[PDB]
Structures are given as C-alpha cells and as structure tokens.
Amino acid sequence: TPSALGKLQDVVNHNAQALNTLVKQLSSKFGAISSVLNDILSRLDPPEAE
Amino acid sequence: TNVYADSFVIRGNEVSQIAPGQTGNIADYNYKLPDDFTGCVIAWNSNKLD
C-alpha cells in the first residue's frame, strides 16, 4: 500500500505547490504592460514606470 | 517652508514642455522639472514689452 503515508506526502505536496505557485505568480501581469521589471524600466518613462 | 521663485522667458510653442516629467528641447537641456514637483506654474504673454 504506497498510500499508507498519506499525510507525510500530503504536507510535502502542499509545501511544493505553495512554493511553485509563489514562484509562478511573478510572471503574471497585475496591471502593467509586462511582468519583467527591467522591461518596465526600459520601455516606459520613469513616471509611468512608477 | 521654502518658496523658490525663478523667472525666464520662453516661446509660446514651448510652454507645454514645462511640466513635471516632460521631455523636449526646453525640457531636458534648459529646465528639468522633478517628478515630485509640488508647486504652481505661472505663465503670461509679454509680447507688448519684449
């Protein structure tokens, strides 16, 4: 029965999912033209970049 | 606290360049206004005297 360690694998899967989501939520646009800070600082002017 | 008062003559087509965070011929090489400028801009024609 490989599913006997339910909680021991569940906590590790939850931690891995939380870390993967926290890392993946950096490439999502929250109202800007892109998700790269360098692109915002390069293309747009300082006022709109702020 | 401090009220700085400067004066200068400018062309009519160059008045729109006097703005916080504005580029132009008389906006990047003669007078650079900061992006956090807190003040008033007073302009008036003086063709009858200059």
PDB file of N, CA, C and O in Angstrom, chain A residues 46-47, chain B residues 21 35:
ATOM      1  N   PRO A  46      10.047  57.135 -16.472  1.00  0.00           N
ATOM      2  CA  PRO A  46      10.044  56.949 -15.009  1.00  0.00           C
ATOM      3  C   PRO A  46       8.681  57.190 -14.377  1.00  0.00           C
ATOM      4  O   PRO A  46       8.282  56.419 -13.491  1.00  0.00           O
ATOM      5  N   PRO A  47       7.921  58.250 -14.774  1.00  0.00           N
ATOM      6  CA  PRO A  47       6.607  58.453 -14.138  1.00  0.00           C
ATOM      7  C   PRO A  47       5.653  57.279 -14.311  1.00  0.00           C
ATOM      8  O   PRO A  47       5.100  56.782 -13.326  1.00  0.00           O
TER       9      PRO A  47
ATOM     10  N   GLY B  21       7.980  65.782 -15.395  1.00  0.00           N
ATOM     11  CA  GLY B  21       8.120  64.570 -16.176  1.00  0.00           C
ATOM     12  C   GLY B  21       7.770  64.768 -17.636  1.00  0.00           C
ATOM     13  O   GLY B  21       7.014  63.981 -18.213  1.00  0.00           O
ATOM     14  N   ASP B  35       9.847  64.833 -10.916  1.00  0.00           N
ATOM     15  CA  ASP B  35       8.581  64.111 -10.961  1.00  0.00           C
ATOM     16  C   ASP B  35       7.734  64.349  -9.718  1.00  0.00           C
ATOM     17  O   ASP B  35       6.511  64.183  -9.777  1.00  0.00           O
TER      18      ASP B  35
END
